[PDB]
Design a protein around this ligand. Sequence first.
Ligand SMILES: *[C@H]1OC[C@@H](O[C@@H]2OC[C@@H](O)[C@H](O)[C@H]2O)[C@H](O)[C@H]1F
Ligand SMILES: *[C@H]1OC[C@@H](O[C@@H]2OC[C@@H](O)[C@H](O)[C@H]2O)[C@H](O)[C@H]1F
Lengths: 312, 312
Amino acid sequence: ATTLKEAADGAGRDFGFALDPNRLSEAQYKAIADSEFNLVVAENAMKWDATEPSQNSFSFGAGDRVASYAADTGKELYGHTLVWHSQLPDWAKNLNGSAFESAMVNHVTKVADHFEGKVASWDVVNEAFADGGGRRQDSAFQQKLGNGYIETAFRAARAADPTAKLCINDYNVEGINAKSNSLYDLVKDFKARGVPLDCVGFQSHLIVGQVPGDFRQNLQRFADLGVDVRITELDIRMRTPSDATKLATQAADYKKVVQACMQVTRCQGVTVWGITDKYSWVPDVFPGEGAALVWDASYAKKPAYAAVMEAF
Amino acid sequence: ATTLKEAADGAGRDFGFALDPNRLSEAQYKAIADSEFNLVVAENAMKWDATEPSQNSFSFGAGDRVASYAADTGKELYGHTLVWHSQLPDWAKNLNGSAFESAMVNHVTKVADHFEGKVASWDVVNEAFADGGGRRQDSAFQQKLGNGYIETAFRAARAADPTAKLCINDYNVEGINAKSNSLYDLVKDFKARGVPLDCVGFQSHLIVGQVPGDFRQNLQRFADLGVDVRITELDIRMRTPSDATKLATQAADYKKVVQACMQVTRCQGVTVWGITDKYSWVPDVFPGEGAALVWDASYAKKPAYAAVMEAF
Ligand SMILES: *[C@H]1OC[C@@H](O[C@@H]2OC[C@@H](O)[C@H](O)[C@H]2O)[C@H](O)[C@H]1F
Ligand SMILES: *[C@H]1OC[C@@H](O[C@@H]2OC[C@@H](O)[C@H](O)[C@H]2O)[C@H](O)[C@H]1F
């Protein structure tokens, strides 16, 4: 193949990227986006703060722009998170009990209903667990609604969009540990009780040379529960600046991740969180680290490119 | 060339179609739209009734969908009419004097401002004249505001979008007659007084075998005034059903129209009002007539296709 899209296509798998609609006006960005991927997801356009800035006041502008792009270029559309503790408008954080639940139910219904027929999969709930097991405590949803909020979100989503794949997404759950265990118990329980849940997303915000050795083993156990798995926000950061060795290691890491997916029949594909290091979110969140994506700040293919290519 | 797009491209000219965003979900429609044209215009998505259904309440959804399509496929975007007597919401028709003028000025400003940078040209004023000379009398704009409404629309448009080509559009003005004469005097006056006006659009809703023999002569006289000309809503209707002779004549008519444009250096291009006869507006407006477009109800190329091809 000449592009990563063909490699993914030939493998019968998805290979997507996080889209920032405002970058489509940049020739090189659009060029790569058009030819290297077969799936697209909104980096921020479909989140709560972007879709419902004020209670009941929805703004689907940017969201629609992403959906239009997918439809116009023939790529699958991945919906990014309906329920998430981060990037939640203050008006929502100010609501409580009944009112807060009604707002959550309404947000899930309106957003899912609006993109019905466009998005193939949804990150219904994102990052509900805490590192080290258990539910996260700094979540407005966990605090105000308790344990049953996630089930309510999945049931509300299925009602608004009866055909979209409803997924649960999280990070630091790639390998077997206390967090992925709590997630495992949840998926197992939901499927046993018939709660609408079709997929599990593994963020995969990894560090160079530290790819979980039991990655595929972990992916497989979830797949055995009767659900699809997917690598949702892949990027492998390193200590900047980059050098030959760091890039060589990063290339081997990207390979391991894709191979793991290729080894699990239910792994739908891999989505890298962005196109070029020039726009990567890493440096702003992880001070001193970066160079996490496949294309550098000059839009030049890094050693990771060929690795992903042959991994497929 | 293998497509009409390449023929138009090689000629350094535009060849567009009227887009109905709801048809992009139809495989054959999208396929033709993607490969046969290099310019696109909203059939109805950007009109007054679609963009401002209620005073001050703008709905750019469908409009944005058309703009996204153009940007995603690399086609030029033609903005279709800001001011038009038809398809005008009742709330507007109920306003008078000052209030009505402020509404017109606001509509022109908001819509032009929203698509600023996307649309290359605008039909600022559409169908302001009457068949037989003079201004049309069944227009809410002409009745409530008088003769100066058009100049006000062009000045308001230029302020909202300083770079878009501001055009005036009309039908039954293809050949030299009392209507095209009144239009000519207007363009001449506007250019002499420095009123913002860059182009003149000729609808070209013709009848089979009745193409104005002085078409190009008429196009040329307008071009000599220092403005660009364009065929905006081309379709050549016949009495249904169609037959070999009718299609043979239609093919020769399409050729004459394109050749006329090719003979006038300032003729920007040709826009056909639709893709297939299956969706053509003709039969609903002109009872008993149809088969006006290049593709039939089965999406099969008619004799007109090859004609347009060689005309370019
Ligand atoms: C996985 O982590 C990445 C996150 O996306 C970022 O959110 C914050 C925003 O400022 C950045 O632009 C994004 O890249 C995504 O939502 C999450 F699920
Ligand atoms: C040139 O004539 C065609 C007209 O477009 C039609 O308007 C009425 C609407 O119901 C049809 O769907 C359209 O095709 C366009 O506005 C005009 F300038």
